[PDB]
């Protein structure tokens, strides 16, 4: 919500949606840039849901956002409408 500490990934929320929400909230957060970096380096992976949190830990600290996106693509999904 009005705090970056309140942003956590939905149980089935696409990782890409969560990161976007996290980003939007962090931009509004009143803190130094170095602190915002610290928040991204810890809170983002920490508040991801259990399934993505596991994939992220595996990729390591050197992973890029694009690599994280690709790795969590489909977790909680596929999210397609049930084609009757």
């Amino acid at each position: 919500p009005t705090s970056i500490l309140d942003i956590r990934q939905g149980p089935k929320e696409p990782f890409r949606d969560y990161v976007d929400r996290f980003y939007k909230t962090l931009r509004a957060e009143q803190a130094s840039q170095e602190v915002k970096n610290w928040m991204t380096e810890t809170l983002l992976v920490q508040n991801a849901n259990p399934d993505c949190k596991t994939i992220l830990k595996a990729l390591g600290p050197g992973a890029t956002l694009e690599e994280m996106m690709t790795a969590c693509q489909g977790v909680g999904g596929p999210g397609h409408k049930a084609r009757v």
Binding site: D20, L26, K36, M39, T40, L65, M68
Partner: peptide, 12 residues
């Protein structure tokens, strides 16, 4: 990743 990475991704 850092906040700057987020900025470059979505940003500017």
């Amino acid at each position: 990743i850092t906040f700057e990475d987020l900025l470059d991704y979505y940003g500017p």
